[PDB]
Amino acid sequence: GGKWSKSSVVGWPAVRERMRRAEPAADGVGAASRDLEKHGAITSSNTAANNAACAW
């Protein structure tokens, strides 16, 4: 199926440090309904202008 001879390079194991344990919290909130809904609940659409997102 072709797609032969291919490889990648460089990496960034920064999250590996904070992701090692997780987050020591007592009865808090992980997301809104399940998990993705917390981040999925974000609607930002700007026309033209500059620097999308990070606004409203």
PDB file of C-alpha atoms in Angstrom:
ATOM      1  CA  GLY A   1       0.000   0.000   0.000  1.00  0.00           C
ATOM      2  CA  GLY A   2       3.012   2.358  -0.500  1.00  0.00           C
ATOM      3  CA  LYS A   3       3.486   4.862   2.387  1.00  0.00           C
ATOM      4  CA  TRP A   4       6.877   3.161   3.071  1.00  0.00           C
ATOM      5  CA  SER A   5      10.132   4.737   4.408  1.00  0.00           C
ATOM      6  CA  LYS A   6       8.878   7.414   6.874  1.00  0.00           C
ATOM      7  CA  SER A   7      10.045   8.690  10.312  1.00  0.00           C
ATOM      8  CA  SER A   8       9.647  11.655  12.732  1.00  0.00           C
ATOM      9  CA  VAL A   9      12.003  13.648  15.038  1.00  0.00           C
ATOM     10  CA  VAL A  10      12.117  16.044  18.080  1.00  0.00           C
ATOM     11  CA  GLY A  11       9.769  15.745  21.110  1.00  0.00           C
ATOM     12  CA  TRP A  12       8.455  17.714  24.142  1.00  0.00           C
ATOM     13  CA  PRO A  13       7.786  15.697  27.340  1.00  0.00           C
ATOM     14  CA  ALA A  14       6.846  18.861  29.337  1.00  0.00           C
ATOM     15  CA  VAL A  15       3.312  17.696  30.325  1.00  0.00           C
ATOM     16  CA  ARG A  16       4.941  14.400  31.491  1.00  0.00           C
ATOM     17  CA  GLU A  17       6.066  16.290  34.653  1.00  0.00           C
ATOM     18  CA  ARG A  18       2.644  17.688  35.752  1.00  0.00           C
ATOM     19  CA  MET A  19       0.730  14.666  34.312  1.00  0.00           C
ATOM     20  CA  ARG A  20       2.907  12.322  36.486  1.00  0.00           C
ATOM     21  CA  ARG A  21       0.497  12.495  39.482  1.00  0.00           C
ATOM     22  CA  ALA A  22      -2.642  14.451  38.347  1.00  0.00           C
ATOM     23  CA  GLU A  23      -4.024  17.094  40.792  1.00  0.00           C
ATOM     24  CA  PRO A  24      -4.636  16.858  44.569  1.00  0.00           C
ATOM     25  CA  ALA A  25      -8.179  18.276  45.014  1.00  0.00           C
ATOM     26  CA  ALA A  26     -10.959  17.498  47.556  1.00  0.00           C
ATOM     27  CA  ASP A  27     -14.496  17.185  46.065  1.00  0.00           C
ATOM     28  CA  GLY A  28     -14.035  19.710  43.199  1.00  0.00           C
ATOM     29  CA  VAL A  29     -15.179  19.642  39.531  1.00  0.00           C
ATOM     30  CA  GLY A  30     -13.477  17.887  36.569  1.00  0.00           C
ATOM     31  CA  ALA A  31     -15.872  18.950  33.762  1.00  0.00           C
ATOM     32  CA  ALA A  32     -19.482  20.150  33.204  1.00  0.00           C
ATOM     33  CA  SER A  33     -21.444  16.989  32.226  1.00  0.00           C
ATOM     34  CA  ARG A  34     -18.881  14.245  31.397  1.00  0.00           C
ATOM     35  CA  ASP A  35     -15.304  15.294  30.374  1.00  0.00           C
ATOM     36  CA  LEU A  36     -15.101  17.030  26.940  1.00  0.00           C
ATOM     37  CA  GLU A  37     -18.279  19.108  27.616  1.00  0.00           C
ATOM     38  CA  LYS A  38     -16.159  21.311  29.960  1.00  0.00           C
ATOM     39  CA  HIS A  39     -13.839  22.383  27.080  1.00  0.00           C
ATOM     40  CA  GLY A  40     -16.468  21.768  24.333  1.00  0.00           C
ATOM     41  CA  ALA A  41     -18.668  24.460  25.996  1.00  0.00           C
ATOM     42  CA  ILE A  42     -16.704  27.265  24.237  1.00  0.00           C
ATOM     43  CA  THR A  43     -18.114  29.146  21.197  1.00  0.00           C
ATOM     44  CA  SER A  44     -15.860  31.922  19.808  1.00  0.00           C
ATOM     45  CA  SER A  45     -16.299  32.986  16.144  1.00  0.00           C
ATOM     46  CA  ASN A  46     -14.822  36.312  14.925  1.00  0.00           C
ATOM     47  CA  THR A  47     -14.908  37.529  11.284  1.00  0.00           C
ATOM     48  CA  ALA A  48     -11.830  39.283   9.783  1.00  0.00           C
ATOM     49  CA  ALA A  49     -10.046  41.202  12.643  1.00  0.00           C
ATOM     50  CA  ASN A  50      -6.821  39.520  13.932  1.00  0.00           C
ATOM     51  CA  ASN A  51      -5.639  36.873  16.481  1.00  0.00           C
ATOM     52  CA  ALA A  52      -8.643  34.477  16.548  1.00  0.00           C
ATOM     53  CA  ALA A  53      -9.814  32.941  19.881  1.00  0.00           C
ATOM     54  CA  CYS A  54      -8.506  34.467  23.185  1.00  0.00           C
ATOM     55  CA  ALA A  55     -11.483  36.900  22.959  1.00  0.00           C
ATOM     56  CA  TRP A  56     -15.142  36.769  24.149  1.00  0.00           C
TER      57      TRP A  56
END
